[PDB]
């Protein structure tokens, strides 16, 4: 059960990262003042990865 | 002798039960590494539902 829980957490994290990366493509090259692009950076915290 | 025979049957039963356990019951002994090492998905899992 613990192994399954870990695997499902990993799978959900991967899916969400993929979805956010997909969404990010639409905000490429937005010209606002000196701002030229916007990104939602998603990462896995080490304190929780371990 | 009866106890050992029953124990052998038992061990076979738990091995069979485990073989269907994770990630989706299959030849997970090496199928796991063979599956995540490459950007693919198990066919059985693909037809899981």
3-state secondary structure chain B: CHHHHHHHHHHHHHHHHHHCCCCCCCCHHHHHHHHHCCCCCCHHHHCCC
Closest by CA position to A17, among listed A43, A36, A35, A39: A43
Q: Which two tokens stand for residue B20?
A: 């269907």
CA atoms of B8 and B21, how far apart (whole Å): 20
Residue A47, both tokens: 């304190």
Experimental method: cryo-EM
Residues of A in contact with B22 (CB under 8 A): 3-4, 7
CA angle A9, B13, B43 (to 5 degrees): 45
Deposited resolution, Å? 11.0
Does B23 contact A at CB distance below 8 Å? yes
């Amino acid at each position: 059960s613990s192994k399954s829980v870990a695997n499902i957490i990993r799978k959900t994290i991967q899916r969400e990262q993929n979805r956010i990366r997909m969404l990010n493509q639409g905000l490429q090259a937005v010209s606002f003042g000196q701002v030229r692009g916007v990104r939602l950076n998603v990462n896995v915290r080490e304190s929780h990865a371990i | 002798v009866e106890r050992d025979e029953v124990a052998a049957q038992k061990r076979e039963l738990e091995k069979q039960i485990e073989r269907l356990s994770q990630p989706s019951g299959a030849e997970d002994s090496r199928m796991i590494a063979l599956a995540e090492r490459f950007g693919g998905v198990l066919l059985s899992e693909i037809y899981d539902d």
